[PDB]
Amino acid sequence: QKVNSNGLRFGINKNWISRWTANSHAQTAKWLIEDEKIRNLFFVNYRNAQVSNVEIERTQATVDVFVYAAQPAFLIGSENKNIQKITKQIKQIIGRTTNLDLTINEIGSPMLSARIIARDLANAIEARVPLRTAMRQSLIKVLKAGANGIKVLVSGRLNGAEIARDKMYIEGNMPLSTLRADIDYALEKAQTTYGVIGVKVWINRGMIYTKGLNR
Template sequence: MGQKVSPIGLRVGIIRDWESRWYADKDYATFLHEDIKIRDFIFNKLKRADVSQIEIERKDGNRVNITIHTAKPGFVIGKGGADIERLRAEVKKLVNREVFIDIVEIKNPDLVARLVARRIADQLERRVSFRIAQKRAIQSTMRAGAKGIKTAVSGRLGGADMARTEGYSEGNVPLQTLRADIDYSHEEADTTYGKMGVKVWIYKGEILPTKKNNK
């Protein structure tokens, strides 16, 4: 019987790279907890900036390079770079190391699973129908050029007494094909009926190993 695994973790080292890139021996646990703290802090601080991914790289023990992927770079940078400098100082205080932050703009947010899932969750919190929210997301993503998308919403849908899961899909989402470029994310919505879970899978096409190696 097939088991459900994270499409991202399954493809790390094959067509995806690690989001944390560093080597540590005795400091492994320290660096791991620091990475978790950094990501939690930045995601909470930049909730409205449509941040999809935070990459962390360490060249040595006292220098942390952070790359923030966002659909709203101006919101993160601020006027004259004031906001990003303030963020850098706060992260530096959090981990007590030298911190450098780079910003990468997301050209097409409709192809990023985390942003699509967050958009569905935001609509659920505003009492939009879970069916309408999912269908809107699917239409936007397919128009943006995706090969396929699958969504699922779980919880007390429509205020029902018993929780259930309902989802929609369009196109192909080959979860077992390792060369398939599939983005996945899980978000939560706080509604009047309790927590609702939102899952999104987006298939963007295939990545061949030869192309990856040539890069």
């Protein structure tokens, strides 16, 4: 079908999820096989964290895991129990050879990000929720909270029928023909008792032409 914006207009306009580099076939294998697990865990284990994006920051066996979240208290928490829990989890998933020093930072109106919307929609789908009402509420919450037009499509089973007829939403200006529009994208896989349902959301962060690279 259509291309995904988070790979189309990426690398020139949007900041990387993982900022690291190295020479060829020396040590990039471990880093690339390691960053994905942490990225997936930050959305699966900490569902309530509401991470707009995790900034993986690796340079010669040291990682500075940054998080952009609406409230630090999701991962910082009261009495610093959330911070120690997340630090120990990421340390056990990263080993003792790499420091963590993770930080959580506020991001301006995180609803203009796609990862949280995709993850929450997947959790709703795999929780056996009415798809119509859940999609309506997600669209309302993502349009009302200060974000521009949205482009949501849920493919797979529609909880009873319409398997090959994916429910695709189109709101506001969503030009994939544009190459600088800050159309953030994220795909997620809901593991429900009907298999896996794929949710993809394009969210407009405001046109990114001549806007730089920082997310």
